[PDB]
Predict the structure of Fungal immunomodulatory proteins.
Amino acid sequence: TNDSAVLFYIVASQKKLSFDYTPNWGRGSPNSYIDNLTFPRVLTNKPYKYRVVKAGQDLGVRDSYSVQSDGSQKVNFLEYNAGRGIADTQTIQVYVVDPDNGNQYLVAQWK
Amino acid sequence: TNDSAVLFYIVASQKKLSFDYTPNWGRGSPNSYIDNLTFPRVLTNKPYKYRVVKAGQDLGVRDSYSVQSDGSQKVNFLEYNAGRGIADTQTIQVYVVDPDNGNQYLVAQW
Amino acid sequence: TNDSAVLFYIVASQKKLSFDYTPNWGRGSPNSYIDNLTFPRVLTNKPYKYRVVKAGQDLGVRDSYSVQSDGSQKVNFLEYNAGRGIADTQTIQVYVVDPDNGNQYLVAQWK
Amino acid sequence: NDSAVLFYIVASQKKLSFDYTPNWGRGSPNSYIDNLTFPRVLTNKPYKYRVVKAGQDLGVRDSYSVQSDGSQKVNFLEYNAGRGIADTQTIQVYVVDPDNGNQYLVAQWK
């Protein structure tokens, strides 16, 4: 459970690097509804896309919003859930889809 | 570049490690049809399942065949493509699905 | 071929990560003398130490100077070289020393 | 959960097997560690080993030949001037990456 060997592999591999995937869940007009997810600074080395899983159900992948001036990127669950937000009773999982190999890495989970 | 720092990080966590994901593509009744995939020694720390993508198209996930006594495991594309094999013209991608987080890692491509 | 899986392992392990190990080599009173090295933003999860080898010769390990307000950290080669700087003619390697396991990772190299 | 790192190693090298499970060899008075044996080492590089005995750096030595079964042995008599290391003392064994000079801990005694 000490990954300093992994950390400095990245240090040696990419001399400068900075990211922040701390989840910011945006609520909706009835507050019991989660409408979106916001990352403060996303990785930009590749055009990543996002897949949303609502309570086990695959909502698919959709075109990504542009990374904004502060480095943030937003996932709008209304794009995935047919114009609706996801109830807070339900579990939400968000994966990044690597465009090069098609891999998927879990980057946010609710409940 | 040089990923020995990643190898010896795994060495520190799991002293023992052995795998072989060399793709063995088995052809079908016309030799131009790919029917299955065999990995000589798969990882067994978790019950992995497989996802198959035929020329960009998601064929989904299916229950996995048992890991054989020699460590092998077989992906039967007839299970994923409704009993037919994939033509050598099409691209096929096979992902391992981590049952813990739902991650997907590509382990074979034609 | 593609280490995005290692990046996103780190996203999962530590939501936020930010570093810059771009070498800023500080020259000395004769311009051909390299007296110190500064990293703009170093990793701070442990009090790392640094080992300097001057042209294959081990000058040893020394305590780090405190991480500065801007996150930078500097290695002063005079602490390693008996009060004198290293000529820019010779090759310099700087290793990070993980204080918990004693591992050593190369983070900067000159000429 | 580090499966994402594991399938990175799979992706890069289809086939790989190693075992650094420490096998400590005792000495003529049993209160002595004479050597360490790794059952199957990585051989993609000529790694060397550095020993630290109770905080003391004993340096690097040429590595013993990798044996037919894939093993490699570190002989503490080579590092400790023809003597074994008392078990009361701490032993650390680092692999030296010959390419960058990195050092990764692969064995530790008490």
